[PDB]
Design a protein around this nucleic acid. Sequence first.
RNA 1: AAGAAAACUGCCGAUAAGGUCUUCAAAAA
RNA 2: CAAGGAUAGCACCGGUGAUUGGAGUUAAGUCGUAACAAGGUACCCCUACGAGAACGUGGGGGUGGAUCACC
RNA 3: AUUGGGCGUAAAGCAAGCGCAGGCGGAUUGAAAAGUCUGGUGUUAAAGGCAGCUGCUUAACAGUUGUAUGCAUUGGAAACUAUUAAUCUAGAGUGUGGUAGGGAGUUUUGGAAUUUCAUGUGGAGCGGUGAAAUGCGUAGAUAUAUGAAGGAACACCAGUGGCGAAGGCGAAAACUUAGGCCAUUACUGACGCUUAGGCUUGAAAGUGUGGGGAGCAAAUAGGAUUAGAUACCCUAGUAGUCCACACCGUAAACGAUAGAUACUAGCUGUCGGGGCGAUCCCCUCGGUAGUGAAGUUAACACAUUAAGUAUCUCGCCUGG
RNA 4: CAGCUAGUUGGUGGGGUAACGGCCUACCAAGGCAAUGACGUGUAGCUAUGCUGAGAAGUAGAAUAGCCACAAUGGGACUG
Lengths: 135, 142, 109
Amino acid sequence: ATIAQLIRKPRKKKKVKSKSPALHYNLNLLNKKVTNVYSPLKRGVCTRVGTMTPKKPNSALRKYAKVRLTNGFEVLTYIPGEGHNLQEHSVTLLRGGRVKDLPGVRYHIVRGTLDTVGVEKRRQQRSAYGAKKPK
Amino acid sequence: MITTTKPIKAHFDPVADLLTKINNARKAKLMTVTTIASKLKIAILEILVKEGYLANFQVLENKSKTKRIVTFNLKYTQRRIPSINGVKQISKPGLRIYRPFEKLPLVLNGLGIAIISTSDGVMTDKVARLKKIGGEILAYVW
Amino acid sequence: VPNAIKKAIKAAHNSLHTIEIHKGSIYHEVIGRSGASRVLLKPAPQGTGIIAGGAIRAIIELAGYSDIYTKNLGRNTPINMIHATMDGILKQLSPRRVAILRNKNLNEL
RNA sequence: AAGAAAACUGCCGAUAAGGUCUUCAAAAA
RNA sequence: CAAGGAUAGCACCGGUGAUUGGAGUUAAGUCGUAACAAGGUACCCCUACGAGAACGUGGGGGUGGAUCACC
RNA sequence: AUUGGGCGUAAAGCAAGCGCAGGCGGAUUGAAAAGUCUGGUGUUAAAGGCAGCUGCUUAACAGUUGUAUGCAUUGGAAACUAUUAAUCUAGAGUGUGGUAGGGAGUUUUGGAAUUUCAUGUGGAGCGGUGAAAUGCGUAGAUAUAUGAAGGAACACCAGUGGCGAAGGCGAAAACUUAGGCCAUUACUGACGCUUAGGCUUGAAAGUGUGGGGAGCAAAUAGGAUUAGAUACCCUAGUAGUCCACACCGUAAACGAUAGAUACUAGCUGUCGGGGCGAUCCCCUCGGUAGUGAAGUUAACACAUUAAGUAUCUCGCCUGG
RNA sequence: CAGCUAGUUGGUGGGGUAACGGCCUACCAAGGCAAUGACGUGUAGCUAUGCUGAGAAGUAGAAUAGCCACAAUGGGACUG
Ligand SMILES: [Mg+2]
Ligand SMILES: [Mg+2]
Ligand SMILES: [Mg+2]
Ligand SMILES: [Mg+2]
Ligand SMILES: [Mg+2]
Ligand SMILES: [Mg+2]
Ligand SMILES: [Mg+2]
Ligand SMILES: [Mg+2]
Ligand SMILES: [Mg+2]
Ligand SMILES: [Mg+2]
Ligand SMILES: [Mg+2]
Ligand SMILES: [Mg+2]
Ligand SMILES: [Mg+2]
Ligand SMILES: [Mg+2]
Ligand SMILES: [Mg+2]
Ligand SMILES: [Mg+2]
Ligand SMILES: [Mg+2]
Ligand SMILES: [Mg+2]
Ligand SMILES: [Mg+2]
Ligand SMILES: [Mg+2]
Ligand SMILES: [Mg+2]
Ligand SMILES: [Mg+2]
Ligand SMILES: [Mg+2]
Ligand SMILES: [Mg+2]
Ligand SMILES: [Mg+2]
Ligand SMILES: [Mg+2]
Ligand SMILES: [Mg+2]
Ligand SMILES: [Mg+2]
Ligand SMILES: [Mg+2]
Ligand SMILES: [Mg+2]
Ligand SMILES: [Mg+2]
Ligand SMILES: [Mg+2]
Ligand SMILES: [Mg+2]
């Protein structure tokens, strides 16, 4: 613009927002304050499981799941892999991600971590889906 | 002697006034231009003709000694293409540019000339380097 | 493809511009403008290599130049990059012609 | 000789989803 | 002198709340067809009223409007 | 996006003006030396940083020497900015002399046309539409002739036009009043540009009080059309449109282009002042248009009234 | 987040502090800061430095090193 104008009101940078906000909140519990501490992966229970149709180009049955992370925040998460065991009260561990078809889901149910049995009968990409060695 | 017919006006900033005059004359293939004369503008023209981008620069005065106008011409070759390629002023009014000697710029790897007025009027970048003294940077001329 | 290939082949054969090199690199820093495309070319010391990418890298290799600093400051359309790159290289001034005109000594200060 | 010449109106709504098709110029005894 | 205690009323901030407002996303739903051509009443902006709804009309403002036309 | 971006059609020029503080700012002389440049000294802890070397089988690593950055003080430089002491007119104003305007407010006046009423003639429709029907009419309508009352707006002139910062300004007159163009052997002598905040104005609709109401017409009623019609058509029809005083402060308030300054081909119009003296036409200085090259743009296009070459200042933009 | 500050601003004599000082005292006054952002809110130990960047700089203040603050919370004092 102008040197004098920019001296008065400097250039304010645009902000940055996270993609997994619910994953960076830690509840102390003894004081009940929410601080902003970044964390790779966290844990959460489950309050509903079932089916839900996808967006437009892709149409197919898909499994979703609601969660109640260690903190006090609920987010809808998708059940990855084939075959599931969640039953309205099974602990789980969640990470970052984004399923394009389903709107709102922004985390992935880590497979074979806590109360989720790893999807057996899996060879290729067995590390991601919690599977040991068939040998 | 030299007579005129038109009124002579100038912008308040003496470096970019000359630069606009020079660029327009270069682009339009024009030869004779006029502007108001100031000692800074006179001095900057003094260093340009020794370095060879314009041929003549003539300043005249009235019969009362209260107003002076300098009328310079550009150095076109036979095929009518100028020696000046582009001029750009750094220390515009408001934001004045001050660089020490060690940070004295080199215009187009020394092909162009940089106008620097340290303490003894305007002086080309190379002779400024020779004297190891820096200061005000007027304009880039190449 | 074969047809269009040989067409462009002959096409370039017709419109070939002449390029002068100084010690394998570009003499003075230059900005090539073509539409909304601006390509910055900068002299480089002998050894850095072609720091170009895309249309500019092809042009620099095909021209003969070795060491060259470039950055694409604009669009990513190959035709405009080639237009901007060639404009920057064709407006270049030789260290000789300048002083000749300028009535100086070859390259001497 | 300077002419012209003239509009005219009823009514008339909608069309399920996702979808091909450019394989490639390397260039040819 | 003074931590602390009791009483008292303002100030700022947070959570929650029956009920309610709109919003986005969405399955193929239900009533029209408002806009894109002169979109079948040219369109758009401000404003006031009215109507299931898109929207209709009055006032002002624009061509970012079609046809039309001149040897 | 200081280096390193933009605001006509893609996000972005406030509706316009008067403007304090701030930023920027004509030419010349003198001083100081606050910026600016440079020399000396001090310091900027060590580790890390970069260069060289050594030692671990080389490395990673460790050690080793070198290696800046800023601040303060002191000694000089005087080109530019800033300060101060003064001069000049070319910037901008003032006066005198020419001069064009629907510029604005207040108070009066005038004629067409509509409506209503009054008086004659007259005798069956008028009105309305795509076609009709509500509606008006033997209580004599429509029509024709005269007169009276009242309100609103001012044909032609009227434009390949004028004025104002914008909104806007068009019957006639008076009073008050604003700005502008041209020539200046006159005068002050930089007094200038922009403008956060502030103030003023600001289409139409809308509000409050009191008048006014001819015509027109949101809302509303009926007749049509329609599958339905709360719409397009028709017949009625209140607020409103009008005036005075108070508010509201929004518009595609558009040239979708902030203001100021200097420069940059040309051609065709048209308007004003000035020069000559029948017009017409020629030249000069300005305002308003068309065409048009360099130049700019993504293109459309702009192009001396720029969106071109540049400066100052303000406002604004950062995916949907 | 537009006013804030009544020991807040100044003088006087005295006391106290290693020392100057409204640090404290009695009297006399009404000032001081603030649109060049007081005050309020939120946040945070600061720096040398780490990572990144061509550069301007952005980012975190690992380890370690300098300075500050703290020792269940809130106050007071002895010794030196
Ligand atoms: Mg019919
Ligand atoms: Mg339907
Ligand atoms: Mg329609
Ligand atoms: Mg219709
Ligand atoms: Mg329509
Ligand atoms: Mg109903
Ligand atoms: Mg209606
Ligand atoms: Mg309307
Ligand atoms: Mg109606
Ligand atoms: Mg209208
Ligand atoms: Mg941009
Ligand atoms: Mg826009
Ligand atoms: Mg405007
Ligand atoms: Mg606007
Ligand atoms: Mg003004
Ligand atoms: Mg001022
Ligand atoms: Mg000056
Ligand atoms: Mg150190
Ligand atoms: Mg080391
Ligand atoms: Mg009559
Ligand atoms: Mg009104
Ligand atoms: Mg009805
Ligand atoms: Mg009617
Ligand atoms: Mg009312
Ligand atoms: Mg607006
Ligand atoms: Mg308008
Ligand atoms: Mg044009
Ligand atoms: Mg957004
Ligand atoms: Mg803390
Ligand atoms: Mg970078
Ligand atoms: Mg540390
Ligand atoms: Mg730590
Ligand atoms: Mg403890």
